């Protein structure tokens, strides 16, 4: 299945992981300078993992995260929101932690819900059931 969401930022977490990693990535993202520029992306969940593709204007073209590299996915533990460099109000933040040549190093990829019928909690639950 594929959902439409806003890709917000990717943060190097070293060995941090789990909810601590998601929360830390959110904190770093909200004070990043300049403010990261969000991009509308196709967030596809499959037996192969998570594949992100442009559904905006090609910032990046495509990124694929093999299922075995995804170790965690959840909403921001502190329930902070993304105020899109735009308007339409605050959007809930969520992300996933991926290991992927750094064995113990992780990266957290952050997103914001965009479609009312595809809320962050539902996306997190689907990824969890299929990949974690």
UniProtKB/Swiss-Prot annotation:
All copies of domain PTB, residue ranges: 2-132
Tissue spec: Heart, gizzard, lung and skeletal muscle.
Domain of life: Eukaryota
Localisation: Cell surface; Cell junction, Focal adhesion; Cytoplasm, Cytoskeleton
Post-translational modification (record): Tyrosine phosphorylated.
Assembly behavior: Binds to actin filaments. Interacts with phosphotyrosine-containing proteins.
Family per record: Belongs to the PTEN phosphatase protein family.
Free-text function comment from the UniProt entry: May act as a protein phosphatase and/or a lipid phosphatase. Involved in fibrillar adhesion formation. Plays a role in cell polarization and migration. May be involved in cartilage development and in linking signal transduction pathways to the cytoskeleton.
Protein name per its UniProtKB record: Tensin-1
Part of the full-length chain shown: 1606 to 1738 of 1744
């Amino acid at each position: 299945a594929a959902c439409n969401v806003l890709f917000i930022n990717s943060v190097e977490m070293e060995s941090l992981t789990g909810p601590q990693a998601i929360s830390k990535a959110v904190a770093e993202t909200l004070v990043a300078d300049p403010t990261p520029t969000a991009t509308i992306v196709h967030f596809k969940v499959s037996a192969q993992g998570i594949t992100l593709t442009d559904n905006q204007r090609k910032l990046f073209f495509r990124r694929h995260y093999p299922l075995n590299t995804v170790t965690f996915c959840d909403l921001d533990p502190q329930e902070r929101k993304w105020t899109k460099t735009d308007g339409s109000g605050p959007a809930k933040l969520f992300g996933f932690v991926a290991r992927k040549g750094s064995t113990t190093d992780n990266v957290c990829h952050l997103f914001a819900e965009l479609d009312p019928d595809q809320p962050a909690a539902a996306i997190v639950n689907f990824v969890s059931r299929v990949m974690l």
